[PDB]
Design a protein around this ligand. Structure first.
Ligand code: HEM
Ligand SMILES: COc1ccc(C(=O)O)cc1
Ligand SMILES: [Cl-]
Length: 393
């Protein structure tokens, strides 16, 4: 009843162009079995959304990568938020929600926007730049570590650590093995910065520690919650912003609409998140036998959710393969859905909005003008190099 497919959704050939295989995955049925890794897969919007919103059966506490924490040792101590279920999830979630709250965004908006404006003006003086290293990486690097309250020394470990975290959700392929082997210096750096004395008063890290006073988290929980922000908080936005610039570069008509109304910046970013889905996949593990899409899945089985595929499913989206900055994006699963829906989404959207706003106001054209190189990661979709010429407005 369930179709078996040999597609390896973690192969380099798949990463290079996932779209035909994602259609095959959707069209084979609502639920598939992936023989390469012995996991179930869901690739249509309806089932991906349903699984995300069914945490009592499709749990996160046994890991959201391929590895089942009941069977294997986690490569690092479990995330108190990503890799926890309610009720254990609830209070640490509330702390991060408050630390990255709407009220908090007020305190960082002027600086984040100023930094985006300045970066775009700087890039316009150069003309011919790499939209990854010089923009998608450089901009979040210029604002997020500071907002975290990180010291200067050691920041070169941030992106490598994140790449490791995202590769480690994958199967034990070469990407994962290479990421984990020797990773100790990256881990040592991040773990050290999670300790209270290393975090600047006022920053996100210190604010997490401040919540230990309230009874919501204990002092020994705080470093792991800071670790969560240092895991997801930089690399995901790098790939979100890179996705947005790549979209604007490929769809000049949409760059022109954005220029004509810069207030579309926020939705232009949200649409980039749907269109590229920088975070491609997460797993769940069944806590019990469960029927899904007419398919009976046993207990303790890994289920792979294709978020990127769900975000391009023609059953749900009109012209899913088009970048449309005025699309009604609500309901997309690029930030997840339900109890684990991205707790850093206000920070992500703030960064994306203010960068797209700066481009909207200052740039007339974005032309790809050199070889484009893809970056391969078991979880992240994005580019390694995106040479572009920026034409000033
Ligand atoms: C465009 C950028 C981003 C994307 C596409 C993204 C994507 C996601 C997704 C899909 C999830 C759901 C995980 C699941 O259901 O298992 C998630 C959760 C999470 N994200 Fe984001 N993220 C982004 C930016 C950020 C930022 C900026 C931060 C922190 C500053 C962050 C921190 C987190 C954390 C801590 C969770 C776990 C929440 C929970 O388990 O309750 N992310 N993110
Ligand atoms: C969305 O990707 C991540 C990655 C790591 C974590 C974490 O370490 O808690 C959360 C979200
Ligand atoms: Cl770590």
């Amino acid at each position: 009843t369930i179709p078996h497919l040999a597609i390896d959704p973690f192969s380099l050939d798949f990463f290079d162009d996932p779209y035909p295989d994602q259609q095959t995955l959707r069209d084979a049925g609502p639920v598939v079995y992936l023989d390469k890794w012995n996991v179930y897969g869901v690739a249509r919007y309806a089932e991906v959304h349903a699984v995300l919103n069914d945490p009592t059966t499709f749990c996160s506490s046994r890991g959201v990568g391929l590895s089942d924490f009941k069977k294997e040792k986690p490569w690092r101590p479990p995330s108190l938020i990503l890799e926890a279920d309610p009720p254990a999830h609830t209070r640490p979630r509330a702390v991060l929600s408050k630390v990255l709250s709407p009220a908090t965004m007020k305190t960082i908006r002027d600086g984040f926007a100023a930094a985006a404006d300045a970066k775009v003006d700087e890039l316009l003086q150069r003309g011919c730049i790499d939209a990854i290293a010089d923009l998608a990486e450089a901009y979040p690097l210029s604002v997020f570590p500071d907002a975290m309250g990180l010291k200067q020394e050691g920041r070169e470990h941030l992106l490598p650590y994140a790449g490791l975290v995202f590769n480690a959700f994958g199967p034990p392929n070469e990407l994962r093995q290479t990421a984990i082997e020797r990773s100790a210096p990256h881990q040592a750096y991040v773990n050290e910065q999670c300790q209270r004395p290393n975090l600047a008063p006022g920053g996100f890290g210190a604010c997490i520690h401040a919540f230990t006073d309230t009874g919501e988290i204990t002092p020994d929980e705080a470093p792991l919650l800071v670790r969560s922000l240092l895991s997801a908080g930089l690399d995901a936005t790098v790939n979100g912003i890179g996705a947005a610039v790549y979209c604007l570069a490929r769809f000049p008509g949409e760059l022109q609409r954005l220029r004509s109304d810069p207030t579309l910046a926020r939705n232009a970013f949200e649409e980039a998140v749907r269109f590229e889905s920088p975070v491609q996949t997460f797993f769940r593990t069944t806590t019990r036998e469960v029927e899904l899409g007419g398919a009976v899945i046993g207990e303790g089985e890994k289920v792979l959710m294709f978020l990127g595929s769900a975000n391009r499913d023609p059953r749900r989206w009109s012209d899913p393969d088009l970048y449309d900055i005025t699309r009604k994006t609500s309901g997309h699963v690029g930030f997840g859905s339900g109890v684990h829906m991205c707790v850093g989404q206000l920070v992500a959207r703030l960064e994306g909005e203010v960068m797209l706003s700066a481009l909207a106001r200052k740039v007339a054209a974005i032309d790809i003008d050199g070889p484009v190189k893809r970056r391969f990661n078991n979880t992240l979709r994005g580019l390694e190099s995106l040479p572009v010429k920026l034409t000033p407005a």
